[PDB]
Design a protein around this ligand. Structure first.
Ligand code: CLA
Ligand code: CLA
Ligand code: CLA
Ligand code: CLA
Ligand code: CLA
Ligand SMILES: CC(=O)O[C@H]1CC(C)(C)C(=C=C/C(C)=C/C=C/C(C)=C/C=C/C=C(C)/C=C/C=C(\C)C(=O)C[C@@]23O[C@]2(C)C[C@@H](O)CC3(C)C)[C@](C)(O)C1
Ligand SMILES: CC(=O)O[C@H]1CC(C)(C)C(=C=C/C(C)=C/C=C/C(C)=C/C=C/C=C(C)/C=C/C=C(\C)C(=O)C[C@@]23O[C@]2(C)C[C@@H](O)CC3(C)C)[C@](C)(O)C1
Ligand SMILES: CC(=O)O[C@H]1CC(C)(C)C(=C=C/C(C)=C/C=C/C(C)=C/C=C/C=C(C)/C=C/C=C(\C)C(=O)C[C@@]23O[C@]2(C)C[C@@H](O)CC3(C)C)[C@](C)(O)C1
Ligand code: KC2
Ligand code: KC2
Ligand code: KC2
Lengths: 181, 181, 181
């Protein structure tokens, strides 16, 4: 029933190993699964972009606090948030609070606002031109977003795993990023 | 749609900063939010009353356990439950278990029992004269309960925060309550 | 409304102390409660069987890891999973992952597959002769499973509690299993 929906594309086609959509699956369950997938994909895309920018030597100018701790002094990856020498835990708490504010008030599907598919958060407020695309281009853009989200999920998982196994003696020379210092 | 519901009163009027009720919000969502708000308000009202009673020098006679630890020997506030010198953790576990029993079996809205609004737990069992009030007085009492609950929420949060910041060097002479010892 | 359902049998008859099904309870609720009860009963039955098999001196041949830690060297009970000398935590993680796979993909009620009652996971895939039983025997087997599950919940809770109180000085001689070692 959902074998022709968004995300079922070559080469795997419809790929449901654990059988989440097996049987008479309702549209609500598939919508929930797709919403979770798109949320994770967007978060992982942002996380991978941030990891790449930080590890490329690009940091915000100035200091993260009044103490004088410069931005380009904390490590990259998990050590930047959780570790002995990381950003102040007040900064992490404020970041989490800001994310919670965004999810409660901003990053949400407001009912009766014109959203036309799962993951559409425009709510009639912010729109950069989601009407010039025809029917096929809209689906193509949504598929690009979803697949990039899946790839970024796997990539950010690999980045954290590799950053967390270096102390244990597993420090390989990764193809593009090199040694994950 | 919910701008004339209970709790929308001067001077703020309908106050929805995060936009929980924005768009075509369903009655179920508002009912859930109001239930959570009323439950928090009742819990916070009881917490503030107990905090004030304990800090005023009023304690239960006798001892909290067979060891001989008198009631008027444990500290006030968070230090009474979580700390080196607090009430026995068996007492805390029993309190939590009793609260769970009350909330699962007693402090609940039993379906098909005559409850009139969200937060009504009478269930046709305990009633002190609710039907004696006319229509306007019922709404007035409900609004009083809700607003006292909000105020007690903020007050108990402030009391806990002030208690927890005294060891950090923040010990102000709070109004009325004085130094929060 | 639910006083004649499965599980309401002599000598207690219908037994709802906390009043979960009080008032106009929906089948849905009751269905969720029965599903949770059956899941807990099956898990506890397996747990009790494993506890008995391990404590009777029956262990898998060989070693649990490449290091050489033989199966018949770890303790019995909670000490086998959580403790200083337990099975490798990699094994525990893999067991939890396998259980999660089973619940997500295998041990579930697939909609539109022919399941007749709550707890039926056949899904038209695995069946050892369920339709061979007549109506009375089907209910009898379901009641036997449910009551054995309840008894197993009590038994596994008692076994874990008795294991955890031996270091505290409470080491009684249990009737059948004797001392827990
Ligand atoms: C948050 C993660 C997440 C979620 C919720 C989904 C959700 C979905 N994906 Mg999907 N996907 C993801 C990540 C995710 N994806 C990633 C990272 C990739 C890249 C490898 C893909 C690649 C992918 C393809 C190629 C396809 C889908 C499809 C689908 C849809 C139907 C199949 C399904 O339920 O997924 C699969 C099942 C799950 C995600 C269930 C969750 C299982 C997790 C892992 C929990 C298990 C825990 C347990 C301990 C197991 C761990 C050990 C285990 C590894 C052995 C559904 C909307 C199909 C689709 O669009 O059909 C319309 C489809 O063809 N996905
Ligand atoms: C998962 C997302 C994520 C997370 C958790 C972090 C976390 C962190 N980043 Mg970071 N970053 C990210 C994405 C992320 N980043 C992206 C995508 C970029 C590229 C622009 C950067 C660029 C960046 C730099 C240049 C620096 C950090 C730094 C830091 C650290 C200090 C916090 C800070 O100053 O933030 C700064 C955050 C930014 C400059 C950009 C954040 C943008 C977020 C992701 C927006 C997403 C939500 C947004 C409101 C959606 C808008 C929708 C639209 C319709 C309006 C902290 C560990 C600093 C540090 O100490 O390095 C070690 C630092 O110097 N980051
Ligand atoms: C448990 C807390 C709680 C809950 C669930 C509600 C729920 C509600 N309140 Mg309410 N209120 C509360 C506490 C709460 N209140 C307190 C303590 C006060 C006193 C300041 C008020 C004062 C108040 C007024 C004056 C009014 C309401 C109204 C309402 C209703 C619609 C607006 C709304 O959703 O609330 C606001 C939104 C929320 C509570 C969403 C939750 C947000 C929390 C903070 C989670 C965010 C976490 C995240 C990390 C952010 C933290 C950082 C942030 C501070 C920057 C709704 C039933 C309105 C009403 O009755 O209209 C009919 C109205 O006019 N409230
Ligand atoms: C959030 C609520 C709350 C919590 C968590 C506590 C927690 C605590 N109180 Mg306390 N207290 C409370 C409210 C609360 N109190 C209120 C409202 C009062 C005023 C009557 C008191 C008066 C009080 C005294 C006098 C003493 C404590 C003490 C204590 C400590 C030992 C436990 C004990 O003996 O309780 C005793 C609890 C009570 C005597 C009253 C509890 C009443 C609860 C809130 C009833 C709420 C549910 C109720 C059944 C609903 C009825 C519905 C109706 C339709 C029937 C412990 C830290 C003792 C201590 O060691 O101090 C350090 C102590 O001496 N409290
Ligand atoms: C709650 C269930 C449960 C849990 C958590 C454990 C946990 C453990 N058992 Mg154990 N065991 C169980 C039930 C359980 N057992 C049952 C029911 C039996 C009887 C067959 C055994 C027999 C057993 C032996 C003989 C040994 C262990 C051992 C161990 C330990 C190492 C893991 C291992 O090798 O497992 C091995 C697990 C098994 C051999 C049987 C597991 C069977 C599970 C319960 C299947 C349930 C799901 C199933 C796929 C449903 C099928 C549905 C059907 C339609 C297809 C670990 C602490 C070993 C150890 O080190 O002891 C200290 C060891 O030597 N167990
Ligand atoms: C106006 C304003 O303020 O905002 C607007 C701005 C703007 C532009 C309009 C907007 C937008 C669109 C945005 C931001 C789109 C962002 C898209 C984004 C950020 C997409 C990331 C993909 C990452 C992938 C696929 C990673 C794969 C990673 C993979 C496949 C790996 O395996 C990683 C690998 O890594 C390892 C593990 C090891 C290495 O050896 C090898 C490599 C490296 C391969 C918004 C949303 O509207 C907000
Ligand atoms: C028969 C039986 O057994 O039970 C029956 C008995 C009875 C009586 C019939 C029943 C009842 C009704 C009850 C119990 C009603 C209780 C109502 C209650 C307990 C209402 C508290 C409000 C607290 C507020 C507003 C606090 C604000 C606190 C604020 C605004 C603060 O900012 C606190 C501030 O603190 C700081 C932070 C710092 C200080 O510098 C300044 C102050 C102090 C201002 C029940 C429920 O039916 C149960
Ligand atoms: C083909 C394949 O691969 O799989 C198939 C195989 C097969 C056979 C077909 C299948 C099946 C059916 C199965 C596995 C059924 C299993 C049923 C099972 C395992 C039922 C346990 C009850 C335990 C109880 C009641 C414990 C009570 C414990 C009580 C009442 C206590 O108080 C314990 C007490 O302990 C203390 C606390 C202290 C002691 O002093 C005294 C005692 C000991 C009394 C499946 C499911 O289809 C899977
Ligand atoms: C996530 C988005 C975000 C938002 C929306 C946001 C809003 C505000 C507002 C307005 C409401 C104020 C007034 C304010 C003030 C301060 N912020 Mg924010 N802040 C955010 C993020 C961070 C991070 C990541 C850090 C940080 C810090 C500080 C410090 C330094 C304190 C100190 O130096 O003692 C002060 C005074 C740093 C820190 O807390 O250091 C301990 C630091 O790491 N902030 N901040
Ligand atoms: C929340 C409501 C509540 C209920 C409904 C409730 C019911 C029962 C029942 C009947 C079912 C019994 C039989 C019972 C027995 C004991 N209780 Mg309760 N008890 C409640 C609360 C507390 C608190 C707060 C404390 C406490 C204690 C003890 C001790 C002392 C043990 C010891 O001295 O060794 C014993 C023997 C104190 C404590 O456990 O200290 C270690 C203590 O702090 N209890 N208690
Ligand atoms: C729950 C069911 C379950 C499944 C479905 C499952 C599947 C696989 C697969 C195929 C996907 C492989 C390839 C694989 C391989 C290894 N397993 Mg599994 N394994 C399961 C259970 C356990 C337990 C309980 C333990 C264990 C272990 C090992 C070790 C030893 C590593 C070492 O000696 O360094 C290796 C190499 C032991 C352990 O990890 O000890 C550190 C141990 O305790 N495994 N295992």
């Amino acid at each position: 029933a959902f074998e022709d929906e968004l995300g079922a594309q070559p080469p795997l086609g419809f790929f449901d190993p654990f059988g989440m959509l097996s049987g008479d699956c309702t549209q609500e369950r598939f919508d929930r699964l797709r919403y979770v997938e798109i949320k994770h994909g967007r978060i992982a895309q942002l996380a991978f972009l941030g990891q790449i920018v930080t590890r490329a030597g690009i940091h915000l100018p100035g200091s993260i606090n009044y103490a004088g701790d410069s931005f380009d002094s904390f490590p990259n990856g998990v050590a930047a948030l959780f570790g002995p020498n990381s950003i102040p835990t007040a900064g992490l708490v404020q970041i989490i609070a800001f994310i919670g504010v965004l999810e409660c008030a901003f990053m949400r599907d407001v009912p009766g606002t014109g959203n036309e598919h799962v993951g559409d958060f425009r709510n009639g407020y912010i729109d950069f031109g989601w009407d010039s695309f025809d029917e096929e281009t809209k689906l193509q853009k949504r598929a690009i977003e979803l697949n990039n989200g899946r790839a970024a999920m796997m990539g950010i998982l690999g980045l954290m795993v590799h950053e967390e196994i270096i102390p244990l003696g597993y420090d390989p020379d990764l193809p593009i990023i090199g040694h994950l210092q």
